[PDB]
């Protein structure tokens, strides 16, 4: 979908925090970079989240695998969204991952 927002996450640190965040990631969510950078991605998830669809994610990243999943998200005023989320790995040339990245898309409207 066109409307997107990206994120990098830092794979080399063991809870894979955020160090990059695109101008929408910022202006959809609500947070800025003083509240976000440095932290894990999960702050997003809320009462609704399906436990299995984390769970999915999180088994991508420690097998170091691309993994796509529809997640129930929530902006810093704790309104509700319907986030479809793609990440990827990057890795060196020695085949270790660096760096997840993440494109998300806000998919309630369809
Ligand atoms: C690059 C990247 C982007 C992510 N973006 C989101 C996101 O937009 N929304 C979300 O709920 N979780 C997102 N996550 C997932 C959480 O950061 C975390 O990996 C997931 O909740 C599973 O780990 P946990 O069980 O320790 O929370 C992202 C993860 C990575 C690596």
Same mark, same amino acid.
């Given at each position: 979908?066109?409307? #997107?927002?990206?994120? $990098?996450? !830092?794979?080399?640190?063991?809870?894979?925090?955020?160090?990059?965040?695109?101008?929408?990631?910022?202006?959809?969510?609500?947070?800025?970079? !003083?509240?976000? /950078?440095? #932290?894990?991605? *999960?702050?997003?998830?809320?009462?609704?989240? =399906?436990? @299995? +669809?984390?769970?999915?994610?999180? !088994?991508?990243? @420690?097998?170091? +695998?691309?993994?796509?999943? *529809?997640?129930?998200?929530?902006?810093? !005023?704790?309104?509700?969204?319907?986030?479809? /989320?793609?990440?990827?790995?990057? @890795?060196?040339? =020695?085949?270790? $991952?660096?760096?997840? $990245?993440?494109?998300?898309?806000?998919?309630?409207? @369809?």
């Amino acid at each position: 979908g066109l409307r #997107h927002t990206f994120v $990098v996450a !830092d794979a080399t640190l063991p809870d894979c925090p955020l160090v990059y965040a695109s101008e929408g990631f910022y202006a959809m969510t609500g947070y800025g970079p !003083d509240e976000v /950078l440095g #932290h894990n991605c *999960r702050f997003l998830q809320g009462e609704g989240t =399906d436990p @299995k +669809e984390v769970q999915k994610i999180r !088994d991508a990243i @420690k097998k170091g +695998e691309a993994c796509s999943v *529809r997640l129930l998200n929530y902006r810093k !005023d704790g309104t509700p969204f319907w986030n479809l /989320l793609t990440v990827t790995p990057i @890795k060196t040339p =020695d085949g270790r $991952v660096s760096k997840f $990245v993440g494109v998300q898309v806000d998919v309630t409207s @369809k």
